[model samples]
Target chain A: QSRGSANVLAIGTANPPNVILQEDYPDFYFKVTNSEHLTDLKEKFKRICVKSKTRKRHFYLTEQILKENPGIATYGAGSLDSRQKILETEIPKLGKEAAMVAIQEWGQPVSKITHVVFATTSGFMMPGADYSITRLLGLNPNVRRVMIYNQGCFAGGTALRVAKDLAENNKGARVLVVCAENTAMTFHGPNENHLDVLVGQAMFSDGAAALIIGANPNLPEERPVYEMVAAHQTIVPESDGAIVAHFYEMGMSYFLKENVIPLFGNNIEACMEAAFKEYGISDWNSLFYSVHPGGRAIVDGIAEKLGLDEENLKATRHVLSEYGNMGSACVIFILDELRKKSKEEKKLTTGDGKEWGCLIGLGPGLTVETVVLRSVPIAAAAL
Target chain B: RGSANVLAIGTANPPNVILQEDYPDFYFKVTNSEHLTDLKEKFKRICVKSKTRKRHFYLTEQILKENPGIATYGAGSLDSRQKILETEIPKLGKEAAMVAIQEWGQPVSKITHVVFATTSGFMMPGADYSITRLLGLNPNVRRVMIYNQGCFAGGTALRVAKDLAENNKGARVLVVCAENTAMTFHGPNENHLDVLVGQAMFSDGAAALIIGANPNLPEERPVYEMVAAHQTIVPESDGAIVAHFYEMGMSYFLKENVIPLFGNNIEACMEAAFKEYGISDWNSLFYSVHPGGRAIVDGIAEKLGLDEENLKATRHVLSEYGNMGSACVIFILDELRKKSKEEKKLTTGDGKEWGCLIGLGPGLTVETVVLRSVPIA
Candidate 1:
């Protein structure tokens, strides 16, 4: 009963207000770290410095800011009343702005939206993004709404896959996927005791993304910008400690420890291989690969395992540099970049076009969700 | 096509953990107030009088004690036994399934499938009571799990019931709805400042219902039934309130003032039902409305323009107990003693047997499911 090919119709993204660079880490460390406590562990500190060759870690902070200006360090701190204000006032404001821009760009009325899926890991919500977006956008009263949380970084792909399933099964059902991660609100002072917490502070950034998908039987049967061929998801047992999102006094905190990188290192290749096999592709060159840029090393490790061309992973690096790890939206940014590249390559081509896309995301349970999509006009030469 | 009969049902209820009648006013004054730097001044500012009725709260421990004989609280805590028993409790997908079949009083092998729903909370390896395991139904029993629908869960549960009946007529589908709101609302925290309001209302309960599209039950069997069902969701006011879990505590955020919006939307939905069913008299229907809170109950009652007596189940549920979130509908239905009282009364006399049940939860959705009861002869 499934009809028409499902295609990614549009993309929109937003990032938080601040940016932190690697070299600025020393000053950040100096300002925030208690020198007296570090002096007590001089030997341990020296060992870490020598072993890691660590100079600085980047953080998204305003320039020349001190810890006292509540806004500087307390991204989410406020009176109980103030926190309520943020949930009641600010989140909907930001969520709607991002969702509206994306929906408007898709050129579809909110009424046409058949399903809405919302993802987040930072904020505690009730009616959640599903309700929030429905009110803001004036969608049909009966739009199927789903709110997914606690799945962490991989949630973006999970949300997309869910949208895909909804669209595929319902036939003609258009899907809207939105993710808002306020990683900044959960930032904690770097503590050496928990390697994961320290790494989390150094990485991850606040961001949001929205995407629309639906059947396009009316469009001149061009190869889908990306036709989702298959997706595979796996959750490793007893690996909850590797990556965790828990609520703190201020807001939600993400603990991405050292073990997660290695866990992904061991399992990601197999997941990709399985996804590729499902789509009838054997090699890395068969598609564009978008690995979640958790860190430079994790991305390189995945790249090396898959034996992908260095150029294929350049977008991951560019996004990482520009926005740090924007959590769920990272993959959306990569997909957008890939789409832009395909458009550019199309203008240069003589006839038809062909491209493939692969996305990978990691979360708790050391879980991985891999999706494969094939571009339209598969046989078009070198586009 | 719609179902013409009900099959079987079961309920798991917690001992009404009395909060107000047991604890002192000062104890509540301390626990209920999240932020109080100057306790006396704070109490004075809020017009705190000793004469104000005591607030009752149900802790997660109370729920654990009531079900399967697991005492989750205490020094001689039943940790090991609780673990073993819980291990036996179905994970996310399979839990509650076996008990549902057992309550049906029919052989397990004879059962066709199951439909499970809950709003408490969920984790991997779902519930053992799930269709896949308990009934030994199919590897693919068409299992679908709905979470966080809150009190409206029963409405969602019934909706699943209708879907199963319509698609697989004559198939015996076990619909189990359970909630242990206790686990999620653990501990005290400044972050959970809204808890002061939530603690005053939420409770714990569960229900299991068997629904099918046939009327072939043996004589002397008790049958509570369903007639017509309607589901409607309010899209624009999704953000008016929410119930999500966080590590620090469970969060219940809402622009409590916007509750009137939910009431208005629900009114429109009720109007649609009246028009669709071509009913002229509102009093003809026995209402089993979800008990969310005193304010919500009053609001819905006022919006529908019904006499307070028509909303007896709702008002009594709130006054005698508290909001059981997803479990409120079933709790009220169970209390209605529909099979024991209504069915017996119908046999002794003569009257049209009809009822309208509705529940509201997240998505700010309203589900109004109608049922018509008849004697089993």
Candidate 2:
């Protein structure tokens, strides 16, 4: 069997029109404060307090803002037609619009897209994102469309990995990867005893991102801000509850913090060690980590456990402060930030300055995906 | 490119499940009469009367009423299940394989092997369930499962046929076509009018045909044999029609009237197939057409100007019985009895028997397959 390589050409992101803040905690705040088991929230509150005390207090302030805007008061009051408009028309249209901008930046015609892979955890419908995008973009009729659902936050990485496979096998094939999430749509009264949902409400946000891979090889090799070198996945068994994405009668429910952080903390170090070994790197100095901006605490825990430098995790913290957790596209936002930084550094440097990137995402089954990336020579040399 | 051939097979279909004419009218009396009106409207347009309806099946109770056999049902009633179990249980893949080997009467254990195709039903832990275990076949049998190719799946199965025949010469291969359409019918829904048409026409039947490099047996075992096959697809139709599992049951939906579009382009596809085979005259050839429905059959008949008598196997299968999905063509073969007569005609008479079998399916794709009838002496 033969193998081929793929490089990311361009990336983009989108979000819902509304951004709710914790200070706006409408009707749901009374329920959370009145719950009997506020004592059980100690550990999670301690973690949140730590994120507030260190790094950037703004991240915690954002959580406070979100608690204030109860979706029930805003969206729940709306007519059925209005709700349907948001779910079927607005969110998906925003996702497609964001993806189109990214594809246009890549400068390839829609007809050239051989494969389209869509990932999301929020909501789905028949003739889903993949079908919608193919029709919207007027892509080749033969284009292969796949939708990855309920894989949780790690679904974006899974989409990229699948894109690489498609590009490699099809030889000259171009792939479009889109991740769209609108967590604001599914808010519920958090159980104060359930530290996971409490922490989750404070940490997640709505967002969409798209990427184009398999650009023409003969094109000028610009400083490769990053190249996805390799990816590996590890699944922790019997851990369904660690991160559950199930449908409730009202809407979708997300339980992200039963034992996820500890499970990730326990196993991620070994996975990273193995990935480093595979790449023949002995130290983390050359690598800048673009971890999914799940939360300030999870990022801090991973940094400490992997012994990665705090400075290398700055982009992740920035995204958390700005957008909270944007589901699957959180890592892409971090990568985009890193890319911007690299571009700035290139203007300042006289010659090449190399850097490696590593990203991690967690989902149900306590699954973890780690990908290693390197700045291409052109991008490095410009820096 | 070199031509490929279909060599051997093993088949199994469930016992015929009869839906008495009065059953629908009687059930309608107590239930919704509007459903009956809808069924009647389709029947009026298609010219299918309630009194003349009967469906066919390959496996009978006499075959299944026995031990050491496994019986499975998809969506048939419990009464049908009890009746099937009471009779001889249909033989498993092992028994079917043995029957195939005995019929071929060739050196079996020492033969070179390549592929297998089955779409009846699939259970986890294994695919092509009874065939491999029952025969104790060569450990390296290249097992390829073709599931949900729908009614026209037999044509897709030929994609595997071309591969084995072209790539593995002197290699013995088994291509099995099986379906148990009678097992499930939750009843009609307007949303699934096209699928209902499919459900209305298809019956339960199985076919096993063998192909190999046996120049000696070509004259003896020749049924209508494979000549060449071509597959052309219309993309993005996955949404236009889908067969997905839902909580209520397995639902099939075909948006609007898409069947006519599939039938409309048969001549163009047939011309392309004929061009591949370097032939000009389609009128001179025999046809083993799929009994998908009256519309599909009529579409082919009108396009090729095939006389109604020449398509007796197709019309008979539809008028008396109905569609068998993937098993429809095999049912046609069973009734035509071409294999037995083919050998006698070629041995005693002089002339060539050429024909083609065509199947249309999910991608809204058309499969045009050409075959030349060979004598089995």
Candidate 3:
């Protein structure tokens, strides 16, 4: 009784209100962690922030919050208990806010949500943010929930792919996907011994993005923004050590190897070709791209490799500039941005004027998550 | 069969085993908590009531002595614990999966997807990534990492595998659930007797299954056709089985009230699960319920009016391995397969065509997976 492919019905994104301009972040981070004495590291961090192409970023961690929880700010203070406590409370709260917006946009009663796929790189707990959000949003108690943790930046696409199967496999299944990212655990004092920590500290921030997805949407009431045609995930060979992130006693810990940019550039074309060969979509310029902006270098590197015009990746670039990287949540933000751009321009389809687009999520495992999306044009109420 | 089937099953436990009778003494000696003789006596009573004969543990006395932080509760020792789990969790899952893969008789590259679940610990590119790397599976194999779902995660992962298998053409989903109480094992605390009771029951184990639809005839045979999967939360049962991490490592609350909660609700949960299939004779079907504890199984059996033999597999797994967290139900499933072979039953599910695999976990969540057994050749 599986019918059609899953479609994105609505999207809602929310970020913590404490926004720090990228230009000012280095000074702010150094000051808050009392690492101002490391003048060389501070200068290096400032350079990274400038090159990050992020004008500003939002954070759940505030000066007052950090001041009160002093131990969590130190790199190895053994404050995981405290750090996890905050994430336990905050991730769901943030998710609920975003989910409510999606529900409102979805224009369906909360009871209609049959399944939830909640992905987060930041939160690690049982009866996770998935459960808390289910309770907070007052969804049906029987809602099948998949709590995906520690999947890293590719998690947004992973959650969507999981939702795709659930929605397509079950009749009348309304899948709600919530991707929330936080740096509360990873935020720490600067250390010269680990330069990669500075890179994570510079690129990552806090946000939540929620989407209502289902197959066979009812017309007029339920609008389909993008029809998820196919999804594929692949691990970059011999790149297991390239990107590593995990939860430790101190907090969430990670290190990024230098060759990751080149590794993705080298391997991504094959991944894209494999995902698109079935559809016979050979021209990259004809399709839109909603790639996770891990960094300016990554987005540009892929764009340059694909021979895509600068305008083709504008949405990805815009999201990177606006929100930095929200880990697993970043791809959804990019997806949301693409749709917003499509609607504003009155494009032929919801994928920024293109009838087809692909969402690319890169993360730990050095994994690439690709989903081929067919845009549902705004001009036509029934597609 | 068009529906997803359990093509193969494998379960593994750590080498260290402690008899339930000697567990209290061993635990007290290791934690250097013999001074709390009264508490030790209470723990011994809990161990007896656990209905567990012996349990395997990944954390040996030597390991505990070296990592003292994890030996004591509230020691701010998650890093020490995670450092060990990061390496061992995947290694243990690999051990169990190696058996399943060998039984399935397919090259590792044929596995199209991996669904790895654990509540033992959390890591990025998690154990799913590590297991894939370790197993030398195809790099493109889609992986879903399910973490911190507590005891019911086995059922949850299986449920997910069913969907993934049926939805994706020729998809082979390797579902693995592993747990190590090394993450939660700690010294007895007088203030929290629940942790002590948990210590008496919970242990370490891993279970793996190869799930797929439309199995290759002759070369592949279905063990149990995954008919359907359903889950429901017990009303007002939140926090009854709360689990969260602490600096001390994993901490969870298992309220005494939950056994009765299951007793009162298991029947309704079963009724709802079986209503569409018009299944009313509970005792007529085989059962593979998670042996979360002796009381949980006993309470469920009593409420559902199930025959004792229907749950022998569940009881047997618990007796030998204790409650192996999310891995327990799969172990029970493996035991059922063994029993069918040993006893020459007509089918893997005790000659019954229909059965249920029940998993109970935090949120007081109950997962019931409808199963139809394959006939023995």
Candidate 4:
């Protein structure tokens, strides 16, 4: 207890530079899906693509590779076999860029990183992305790595829990958490008529986010995003069918059940309540919300249910509109925005000691992953 | 700073135990590809040469009836595989969990956390969700799902349980390691030469371990004390054991380089762990090695100059279960417990209180999970 602290050192996001605006995507999608004979979706997507809350999203593949098969993806831009393939290579590259950003921002030598927890539901490979991230950064060869796969959207939150545990249980531990997601590959190009597929295409995008969790600095003049007080999770049994990502001939498909909105809305309040109670969080006002932008409706449902106004969801909505739903990486993307706000405005929290924030991520099983962060001001950096 | 304990372990095999001799006829019947010369001979030769005596799978009549083309793995492709996994994994995993908790004298509802691991068949609202639902664990009971890791998963699972237990005081983590290799069966037309080894070696099985920190509860049966665990990943070696996407499921292949790649550093990995525990000789220390294959055991043995008798548990598991992938080491541990209970031979700690668990997976990651056995008070 004396040595352990799961302080969030920094948050960073790296997205590919090919900014595909929602405005131009309709025409791009129209040309691609023209030959595929997806009339019902093609017509709806003309309306769907632009109206999706996201104004911009990123892509690693060139338009040529995506346009090759016209609205479909293959193994080469990458394939599962080649590490150079889109998912196998691009996702890890995105993660490396993001991890380096956070590591550099935290001002810690790469050699000091003692553990790595990687979360992904999109890519498939052995030696895993964590191994690549470790090697790419030239961290200590003995750094312990934990890979969390197929945990879906809330997986980033799962990584946070693991990171916190590593920091708390081990003395002087530095845990690096990298979350890479390319829902664009899993659900973007395929002309599948499944409503879930359509939603994924409209809402999800490719991005990576990385955060460094370590012991709070004692000589500390350096400011951190926040120290992790605790991370909690709950699986809604009845809502298991609500959000699903399954494997098939093409790739994994993201699906949201018809009754999902209500299930999630109903269960989240209780989840947050339990977490808040356990952490002795009595005032909801001081606690900011980093809700996963699964969609506009899901976000609205949470705000409405919890009596949170749009102000509470500023970062979430900002990321939602800018990057769409970036899967596991979205949480850090949201936190990264809050980090910027904290540094620039000093308004990300009230400078008083009561400042706290809660992050929520949802996935299959309608799982609710909540992580609570308590802010200690830069003025009080040294312990 | 406190220690985590691995309580009793219980493994449940699926209902159907297919014998090694009869496996070929079963495969021929399923594929109906007996007429193909090379394919038939390849499969038959591999099965006959395999060290496995029997292996179990949960592909029941009802599952096959519901999921057609599963045996043939037709154009329905990985759909059938996913279906089998979604239906059978929870069942197999839950059966094993029930036995584990019962053996540990803990009620199912008392579990503080659940960590489910698998890389074979996949479904959402995963094995953890359904298992929690069935057992009615506390709604707020935390859970983490670890997936897509290759054969070294058992060693990883124990390490995770240790972390959870150490982080949360008096925590009991129910770690379930399951794989449905039956769903990964390669069809006749798509069979590459590399596929034969999997067909020959792997089998479906599930193992459940209940681990906790019980400095508060002395009445609890003391299991194994985790001394030190280390995960060592070789730099620039991510491509060694690759699981490439084939069609519906991933096609796994062990590169020839993996054999030596693992052998080279295993001694160093164990030496670091053993030295920390003040262990000198390897003769008396119990070794729980993941038997990925016969060659894996041989490769590791030759590198360390270890005695063949020290590998009895590993070799016996391989012969009995034929490389049950991530579940092999757990099976070996269970076998050791049975052997000791029956003979009362090696239970006494004769100066060698340390035991080392070694496992290897993709990324050429060589993991050594070391444990110090505490005498039950």
Interface RMSD of 4: 2.8
For model 4, residues B95-133, the per-residue Cα lDDT tens digits are: 778878887887767788898877777666678887888
lDDT of each: 0.56, 0.54, 0.88, 0.74
DockQ, candidate 3, vs. native dimer: 0.80
Maximum-TM-score candidate: 3
lDDT of 4: 0.74
Provide the TM-score for each candidate, comma-separated.
0.68, 0.57, 0.98, 0.92
lDDT of 1 at A132: 66
The lowest-lDDT stretch of 10 consecutive residues in candidate 3 chain B is B247-256
Clashing pairs in 4: A75-A78, A75-A79, A78-A85, A78-A86, A127-B363
Tens-digit per-residue lDDT, B81-149, candidate 1: 223222232332233344445656766544454545554543332332233444455332333345555
> Which sequence of candidate numbers ranks them by lDDT, best first?
3, 4, 1, 2
Off by over 4 Å in 3: A381-383
Candidate 1, residues A1-383, lDDT tens digits: the string is: 25654566667776545554545543454355433354534444334333332233223333343343333244334222223334433445555666776776676567778777777654545555566677778777666665665456777777776666566655467778887766444554444554454455545666677888776533432123466665556654335456554333344445565666667777666677766765566777545766787766678777777777766776666667666666777787777666666566653211113366678876655667677776655233122
* Model 4 lDDT tens row, A1-383: 43756888777789888788888876665565442466677767766676668888886655676564332453212222222255777777889999988887777688878899998877666767888788788888888889887788888788998898888887777888999887544644534446566667678788899988887563443455677888888876576567776665556756677787788887777877777896676666567777899888888888877877666788789999999888899988987876665556654342223377888988887788989877666455322
Q: Which stretches of candidate 4 lie over 4 Å from their true place?
A: A35-43, A46-51, A69-84, A188-193, A218-222, A278-280, A348-354, A380-383, B32-49, B59-76, B188-191, B215-218, B235-238, B346-352
The order by descending DockQ is: 3, 4, 1, 2
**For model 3, what is the alpha-carbon lDDT of residue A364?**
82
Better of 1 and 3 by lDDT: 3
Error of 3 at A66 (Å): 0.5
Highest lDDT, which number?
A: 3
TM-score-wise, the better of 2 and 3 is 3
